[PDB]
mmCIF file of C-alpha atoms in Angstrom:
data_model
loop_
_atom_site.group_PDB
_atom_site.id
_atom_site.type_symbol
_atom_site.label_atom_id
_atom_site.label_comp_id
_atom_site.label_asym_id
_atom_site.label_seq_id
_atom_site.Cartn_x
_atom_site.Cartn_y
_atom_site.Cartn_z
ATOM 1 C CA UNK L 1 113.450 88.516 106.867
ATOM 2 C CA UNK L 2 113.617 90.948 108.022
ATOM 3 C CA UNK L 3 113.770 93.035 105.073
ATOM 4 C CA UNK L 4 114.363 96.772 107.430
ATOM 5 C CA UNK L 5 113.920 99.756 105.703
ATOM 6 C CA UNK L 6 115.656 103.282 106.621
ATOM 7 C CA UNK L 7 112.161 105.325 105.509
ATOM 8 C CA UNK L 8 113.587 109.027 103.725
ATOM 9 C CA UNK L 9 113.918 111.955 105.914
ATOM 10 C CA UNK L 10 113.751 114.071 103.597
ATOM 11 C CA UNK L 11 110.465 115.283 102.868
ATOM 12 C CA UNK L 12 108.691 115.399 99.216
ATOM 13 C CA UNK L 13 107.484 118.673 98.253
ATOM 14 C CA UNK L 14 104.022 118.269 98.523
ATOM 15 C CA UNK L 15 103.722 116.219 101.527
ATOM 16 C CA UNK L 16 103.105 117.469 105.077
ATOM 17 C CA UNK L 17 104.943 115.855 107.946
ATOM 18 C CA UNK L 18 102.937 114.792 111.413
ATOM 19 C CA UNK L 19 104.620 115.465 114.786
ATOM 20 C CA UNK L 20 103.971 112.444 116.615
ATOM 21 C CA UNK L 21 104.745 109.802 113.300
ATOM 22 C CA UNK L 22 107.475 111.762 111.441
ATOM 23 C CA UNK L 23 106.655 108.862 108.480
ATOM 24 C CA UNK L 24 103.645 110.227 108.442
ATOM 25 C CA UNK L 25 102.541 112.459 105.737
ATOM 26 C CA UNK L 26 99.257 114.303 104.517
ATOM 27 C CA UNK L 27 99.429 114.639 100.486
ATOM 28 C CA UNK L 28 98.925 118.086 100.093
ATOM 29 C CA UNK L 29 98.135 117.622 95.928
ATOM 30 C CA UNK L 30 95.258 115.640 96.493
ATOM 31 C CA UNK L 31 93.248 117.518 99.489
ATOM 32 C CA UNK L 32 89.950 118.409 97.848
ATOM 33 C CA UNK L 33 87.280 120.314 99.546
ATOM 34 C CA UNK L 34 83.189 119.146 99.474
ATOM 35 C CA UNK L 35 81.324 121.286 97.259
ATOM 36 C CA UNK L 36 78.219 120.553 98.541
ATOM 37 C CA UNK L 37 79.246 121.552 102.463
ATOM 38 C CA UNK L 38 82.538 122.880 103.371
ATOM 39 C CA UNK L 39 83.558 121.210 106.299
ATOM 40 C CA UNK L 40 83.913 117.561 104.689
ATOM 41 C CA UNK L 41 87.820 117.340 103.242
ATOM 42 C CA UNK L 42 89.084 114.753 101.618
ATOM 43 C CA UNK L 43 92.765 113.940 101.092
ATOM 44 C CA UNK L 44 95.309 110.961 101.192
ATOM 45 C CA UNK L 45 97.436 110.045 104.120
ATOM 46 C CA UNK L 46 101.024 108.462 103.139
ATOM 47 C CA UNK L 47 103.079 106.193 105.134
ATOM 48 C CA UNK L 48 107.040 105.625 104.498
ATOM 49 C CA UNK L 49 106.890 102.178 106.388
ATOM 50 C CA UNK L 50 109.682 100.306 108.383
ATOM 51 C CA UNK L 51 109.621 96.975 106.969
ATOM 52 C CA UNK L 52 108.584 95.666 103.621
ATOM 53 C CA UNK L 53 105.541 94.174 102.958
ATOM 54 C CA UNK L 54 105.044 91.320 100.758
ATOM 55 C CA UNK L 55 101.781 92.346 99.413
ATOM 56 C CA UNK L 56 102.432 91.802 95.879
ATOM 57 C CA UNK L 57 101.467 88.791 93.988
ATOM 58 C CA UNK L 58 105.244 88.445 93.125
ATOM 59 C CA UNK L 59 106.727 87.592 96.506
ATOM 60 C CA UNK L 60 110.142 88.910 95.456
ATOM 61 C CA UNK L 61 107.998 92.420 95.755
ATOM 62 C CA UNK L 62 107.158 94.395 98.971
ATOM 63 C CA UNK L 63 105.692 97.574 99.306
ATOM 64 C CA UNK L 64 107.753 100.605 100.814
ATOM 65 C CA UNK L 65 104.661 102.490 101.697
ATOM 66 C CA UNK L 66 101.235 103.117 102.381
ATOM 67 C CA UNK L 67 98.495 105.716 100.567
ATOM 68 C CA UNK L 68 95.178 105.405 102.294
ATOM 69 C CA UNK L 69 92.502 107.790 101.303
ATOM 70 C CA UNK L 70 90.739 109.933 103.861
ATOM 71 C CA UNK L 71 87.532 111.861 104.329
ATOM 72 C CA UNK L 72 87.507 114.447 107.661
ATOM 73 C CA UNK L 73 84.307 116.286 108.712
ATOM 74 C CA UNK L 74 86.000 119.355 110.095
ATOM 75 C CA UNK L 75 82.729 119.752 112.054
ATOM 76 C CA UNK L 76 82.701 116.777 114.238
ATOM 77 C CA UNK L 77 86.053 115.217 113.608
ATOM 78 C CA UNK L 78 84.680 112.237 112.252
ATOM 79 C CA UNK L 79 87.123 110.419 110.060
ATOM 80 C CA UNK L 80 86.663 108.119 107.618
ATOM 81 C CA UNK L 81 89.066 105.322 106.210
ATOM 82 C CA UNK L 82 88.153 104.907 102.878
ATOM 83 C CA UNK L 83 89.931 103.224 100.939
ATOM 84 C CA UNK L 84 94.560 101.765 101.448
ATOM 85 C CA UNK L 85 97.181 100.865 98.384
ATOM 86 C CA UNK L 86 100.554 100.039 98.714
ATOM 87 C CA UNK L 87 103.399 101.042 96.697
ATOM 88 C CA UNK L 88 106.991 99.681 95.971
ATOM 89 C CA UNK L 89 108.337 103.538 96.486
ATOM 90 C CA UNK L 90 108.438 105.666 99.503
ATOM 91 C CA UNK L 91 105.767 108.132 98.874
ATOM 92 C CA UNK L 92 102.718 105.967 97.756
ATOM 93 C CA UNK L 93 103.933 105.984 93.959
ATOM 94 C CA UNK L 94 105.287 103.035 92.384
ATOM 95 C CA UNK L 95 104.134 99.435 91.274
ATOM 96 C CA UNK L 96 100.704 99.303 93.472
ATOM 97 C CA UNK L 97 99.122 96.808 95.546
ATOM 98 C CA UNK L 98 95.430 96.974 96.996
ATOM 99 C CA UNK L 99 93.992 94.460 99.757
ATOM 100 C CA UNK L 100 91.739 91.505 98.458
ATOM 101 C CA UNK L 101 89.173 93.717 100.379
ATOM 102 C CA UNK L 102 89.078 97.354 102.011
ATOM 103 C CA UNK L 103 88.488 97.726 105.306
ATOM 104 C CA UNK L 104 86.246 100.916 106.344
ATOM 105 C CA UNK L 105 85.888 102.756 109.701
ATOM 106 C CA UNK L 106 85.166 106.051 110.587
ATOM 107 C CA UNK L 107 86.534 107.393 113.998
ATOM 108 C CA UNK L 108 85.567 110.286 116.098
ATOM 109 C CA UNK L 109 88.981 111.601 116.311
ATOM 110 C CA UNK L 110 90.540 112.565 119.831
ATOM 111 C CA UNK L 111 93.575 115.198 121.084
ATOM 112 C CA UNK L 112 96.775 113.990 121.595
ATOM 113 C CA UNK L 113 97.019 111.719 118.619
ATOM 114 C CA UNK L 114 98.695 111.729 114.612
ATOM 115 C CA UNK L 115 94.899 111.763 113.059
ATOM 116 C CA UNK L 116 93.575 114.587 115.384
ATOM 117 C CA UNK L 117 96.517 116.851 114.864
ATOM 118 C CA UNK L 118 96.417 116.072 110.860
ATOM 119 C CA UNK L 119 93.074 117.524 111.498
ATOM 120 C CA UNK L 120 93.817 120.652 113.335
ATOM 121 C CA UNK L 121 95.907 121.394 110.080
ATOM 122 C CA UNK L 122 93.447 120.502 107.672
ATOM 123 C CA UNK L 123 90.482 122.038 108.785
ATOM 124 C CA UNK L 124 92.342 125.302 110.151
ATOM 125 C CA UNK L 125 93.766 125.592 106.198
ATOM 126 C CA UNK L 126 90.925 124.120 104.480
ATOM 127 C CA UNK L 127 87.486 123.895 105.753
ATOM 128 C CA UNK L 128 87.693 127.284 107.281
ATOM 129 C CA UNK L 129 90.547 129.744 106.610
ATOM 130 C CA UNK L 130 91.486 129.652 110.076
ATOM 131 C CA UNK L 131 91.535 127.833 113.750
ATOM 132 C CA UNK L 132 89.116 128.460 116.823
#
């Protein structure tokens, strides 16, 4: 209590900032495009948190951020949580910590928002080589 944290502002190679949360990142190593059709993209969202969370089963421990994997349909906008570990680092590495259970969702993304404009990035550099 109340265990603040000044998250880095200095970005990680690799990781691509959002406008509207600027401690939000896309993880640009682990974007991998669907095979099978090419509008489905899957990648992991990070988040350099505020405050610690004591997610660990050591409560000495909290967690500095947040790595929650993502799948977008470029097509419809449709994105699905999938999975959400935390980590004792900024930039979802460290000593990790998963819920007891994961919660999954899929949202049909709309403008004006973190997700939607993570999007507009993805899917205008990877499920098509460019915007419309």
């Amino acid at each position: 209590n109340d265990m603040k944290l000044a998250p880095p502002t200095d970005v990680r190679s690799g990781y691509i900032r959002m406008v509207k949360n600027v401690n939000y990142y896309i993880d640009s190593e682990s974007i991998w495009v669907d095979n099978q059709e090419p509008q489905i993209v899957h990648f992991d969202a990070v988040v350099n948190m505020d405050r610690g969370l004591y997610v660990y089963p050591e409560p000495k421990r909290y967690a500095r951020s947040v790595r929650q994997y993502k799948i977008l349909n470029c097509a419809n906008y449709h994105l699905t949580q999938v999975r959400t570990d935390f980590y004792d680092e900024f930039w979802g590495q460290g000593l990790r910590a998963a819920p007891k259970k994961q919660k999954k969702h899929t949202l049909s993304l709309t403008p004006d928002t973190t997700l939607y404009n993570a999007a507009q990035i993805i899917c205008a550099n990877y499920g098509k080589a460019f915007s419309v």
